[PDB]
Design a binder for this molecule. Structure first.
Ligand code: V2M
Ligand code: V2M
Lengths: 299, 303
């Protein structure tokens, strides 16, 4: 098993750069709107303690430089929505894919198209942690890079990059500008809460192991969802929700192993350990593959 | 900040993928200018693939025997030749989205991005390394043949891999875009083993430097080693020898971190002899060898 990103071309065709003063970052051009982090309006000193409503009052359309490559797109309107700026431009992007804006849950994965100066640089798969950070790879100039999933022909954008934390993980918003987690867009060191293991994804991984004939860990027991959640929390594992149980449905049907029987197997692995054994060639339980990723790599 | 297995953006390649069908055999092709490149075993029937005389099988085909679909459009084949294990279909239409490109044959230990495709449709993109035994640890399913591997520099796509085969061990084998396999493999329907799969030492060292740049030094030690004494231990553990060129190529990472290359060699020697003792590096419980020094430099320079 490996991390696989979605093909990035539909998103590449939407990346632009946005500059205000000497402050430059990336934006997302869909139809005639460009979406970007609102701190582009800040000088470096402004970002220490910004009052964004007051800073924006001092800006007009003609203070925003939007470029597709080196080609300028004239800005004809602007507004703030939470921590994102929306710049209306006078050109509808001919490369706009079918798209939606979605807000994901911890545990869900997405592809990040890391960009610099409006130019796509690399693509990789990330998982939203329970503490609402991602382990990205981002350098200066990466803000406004986006994360997304592709379903059929539709790009679902879920993430726009804003922040690195002192621990070197990343934080950002959805495309309506609402941060994931307790973070704010300020030039300040902010701590993320203690993280936990993504249980639903570990279960998906165990189903993947079974699909491939690696099933020594299957035990004879079952559990209730409540009892499992209480045990899991003592091992720093997330509780399962009903949605988690439901998204495990297809893998449960494919293998014939009920979700709560697999939970009882995992409980035993937590309580008793691996006994120097491996699962899918690994002593670590992997928690960054969703049930969809498992299906997507097995078929 | 951070270090992740990263692929190049795939859009320039997506615009070149098409579907090639001959008989009941369908796989992917690569459409550049007015030529479509694909694995020649498309011309094969199920019975042919056991021992295909490709020159014999190809001469019996006509241009119209090849159905090339690009999205909803069918491209008319107006010529066809064979270059080793790659078929070259001349089409009457030049692909308008052809990027600047070159064909290159990659060296073992180098990385490239793979755009996995099915029925001419891009499905996923990931980074691989060409292993010392000339296999790649890919993710490919039925119908993935003709998927390509590439690197991008500025605006130029260097195609280096086209996919053909899975081995019994689950690793993968393919050719360059001149149709020559990497490794001792053959495009016939047989179970093939690779040579011994050694570890790309210069890459493990780069990844250790990446781990240091990202704040983890638990594996470092106060010891050093000579290059030869390191290589003696490395070869004992089925690692490739480190050459002076590798040492030099690691210079920028050594400069950035302040850790002499042979001091990092002494760290790796200790990891090989003692193991990792349940600890992890950059989240991995194994020594990773599929990032090149340049992969690390481009993600971690300045951090
Ligand atoms: C965007 O490029 C800014 O436009 C930038 C992305 C980071 C640069 C290096 N890697 C990244 O992911 N974001 C920032 O520089 C933000 C700007 C905010 C939104 C105004 N700043 C931080 O992420 C930042 C500031 C501080 C800090 O201060 C003090 C102390 C510790 C961490 C930290 N992160
Ligand atoms: C191509 O899509 C075929 O067009 C296909 C890709 C593999 C399918 C499963 N995963 C893959 O990477 N390649 C093949 O099916 C090739 C066809 C050759 C080039 C004629 N064959 C193999 O991959 C192959 C055959 C055998 C085998 O036999 C008998 C025994 C064991 C492994 C094996 N692989």
């Amino acid at each position: 098993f490996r991390k696989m990103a979605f093909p990035s071309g539909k998103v590449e065709g939407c990346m632009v750069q946005v500059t205000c003063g000497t402050t430059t970052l990336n934006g997302l051009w869909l139809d005639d709107v460009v979406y970007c982090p609102r701190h582009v309006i800040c000088t470096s000193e402004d970002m220490l303690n910004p009052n964004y409503e007051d800073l924006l009052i001092r800006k007009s359309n003609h203070n925003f430089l939007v470029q597709a490559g080196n080609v300028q797109l004239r800005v004809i309107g602007h507004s703030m929505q939470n921590c994102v700026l929306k710049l209306k431009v006078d050109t509808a992007n001919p490369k706009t894919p079918k798209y939606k804006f979605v807000r994901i849950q911890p545990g869900q994965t997405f592809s990040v198209l890391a960009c610099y100066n409006g130019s796509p640089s690399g693509v990789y798969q990330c998982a939203m942690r329970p503490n609402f950070t991602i382990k990205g790879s981002f350098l200066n100039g990466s803000c406004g890079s986006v994360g997304f999933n592709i379903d059929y022909d539709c790009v679902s954008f879920c993430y726009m990059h804003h922040m690195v934390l002192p621990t070197g993980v990343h934080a950002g918003t959805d495309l309506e500008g609402n941060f994931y987690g307790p973070f704010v867009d300020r030039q300040t060191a902010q701590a993320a809460g203690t993280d936990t293991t993504i249980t639903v994804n570990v279960l998906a991984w165990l189903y993947a192991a079974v699909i491939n004939g690696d099933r020594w860990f299957l035990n004879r027991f079952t559990t209730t969802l409540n009892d499992f959640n209480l045990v899991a929390m003592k091992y720093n594992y997330e509780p399962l929700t009903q949605d988690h149980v439901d998204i495990l449905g297809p893998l449960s049907a494919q293998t014939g192993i009920a979700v709560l029987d697999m939970c009882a197997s995992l409980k035993e692995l937590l309580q008793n350990g691996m006994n120097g054994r491996t699962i899918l060639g690994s002593a670590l339980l992997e928690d960054e593959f969703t049930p969809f990723d498992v299906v997507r790599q097995c078929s």
